[PDB]
């Protein structure tokens, strides 16, 4: 009816880690219809947006974003590692992100 979508959906999982260590430089993302390693490589250069809400106004608005990039896959099941301009807060680990399609090929 209105407000076209033009992106693919995703959920932000935790950080890149082992058992007992953290490494918060990269974050792991899951994409909605992608569940093989070969299909995940399709998205290997796209731009990622994380949009959330606040309670006060900050520049006249109550919404702000944190931008990132898709860097590589995470092995055999269509998960990806993403690098953001700032580290994602850990109070976000089940929220939504937008896997855009801007840098088109």
């Amino acid at each position: 009816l209105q407000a076209v979508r033009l992106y693919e959906k995703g959920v932000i999982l935790g950080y890149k880690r082992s058992q007992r260590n953290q490494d918060p430089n990269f974050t792991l993302i899951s994409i909605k219809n992608v569940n093989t390693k070969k299909h995940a490589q399709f998205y290997v250069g796209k731009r990622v947006a994380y949009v959330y809400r606040t309670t006060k106004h900050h520049d006249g608005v109550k919404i702000k974003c944190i931008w990132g990039k898709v860097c590589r896959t995470h092995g055999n099941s269509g998960v990806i590692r993403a690098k953001f301009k700032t580290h994602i807060p850990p109070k976000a680990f089940g929220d939504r992100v937008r896997i855009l399609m801007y840098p088109s090929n």
Partner: protein, 201 residues
Amino acid sequence: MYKKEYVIDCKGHLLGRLASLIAKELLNGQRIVAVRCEDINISGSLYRNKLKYQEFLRLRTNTNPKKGPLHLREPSKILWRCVRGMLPHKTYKGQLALKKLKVCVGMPYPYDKKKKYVLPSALRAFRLKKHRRYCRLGTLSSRVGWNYDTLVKKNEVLRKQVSKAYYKKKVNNLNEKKEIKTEALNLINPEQRQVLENFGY
């Protein structure tokens, strides 16, 4: 895992494999509602599982049993406690995940009219060779003092009758719609009819 809420009927699933697939969905963030918990299967003889429960029943805090392990013998609470033992439930996030699960015996109102799914990687028909032994969670819970096995079946009978009538009406509606469809194909511009024909609609 991109839905507001999933509804699963557990009739025919093995307890451990189902409990493992639910915990990761809860951790990633997904509401789950589990129904018909009295029809869950386990992969040993009924006597072999009764002995295991008897071992579970005799461990308790010596000085004060009000504390200590609490033995819950309804079938739905058994699955609840088996899932709880696969989550890090002593942090904050892991306690948030445990609260996004709801369990029922039978199939009460809000969910008797919703769509139910199954998990094929936990179905007994695909996972257990046919000459092995297995038991039913309702019988086992009755053997250790649950006392509501009969009433659930009595209610399931009525639910199934109502569902059968609904299905009859649905089939009639679908046929009536198919006739209206097949008539209207003749009254369209021919090229739209070819483009629908080519793509199998």
